[PDB]
Write a protein that binds this DNA or RNA. Structure first.
Ligand SMILES: [Mg+2]
Length: 61
DNA sequence: TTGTGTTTTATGAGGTCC
DNA sequence: GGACCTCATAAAACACAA
């Protein structure tokens, strides 16, 4: 497949800041995050998908 | 500092949207 | 005629009882 590479403190800080601002990434913010973090647009899109799955688990009960 | 449950990336199947 | 997300899933890495 492709062996996963965990994101740095600096990369996660940027992703969580945007996620806190909006649960859904805009095309414009995805490019900004891509430039800031060196993650691909694809990675940023997937991380948002995964973050909403995590937030959904937090609505346990 | 072992072990092995949870959390974090990453994928592909199957959906919505004129 | 493509871009987008939710879902179940797998595996690498983490967190921390033991
Ligand atoms: Mg849907």
């Amino acid at each position: 497949r492709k062996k996963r590479i965990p994101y740095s403190k600096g990369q996660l800080r940027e992703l969580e800041r945007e996620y806190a601002a909006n649960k859904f990434i805009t095309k414009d913010k995805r490019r900004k995050i891509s430039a800031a973090t060196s993650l691909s647009e694809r990675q940023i899109t997937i991380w948002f998908q995964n973050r909403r799955v995590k937030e959904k688990k937090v609505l346990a009960k």
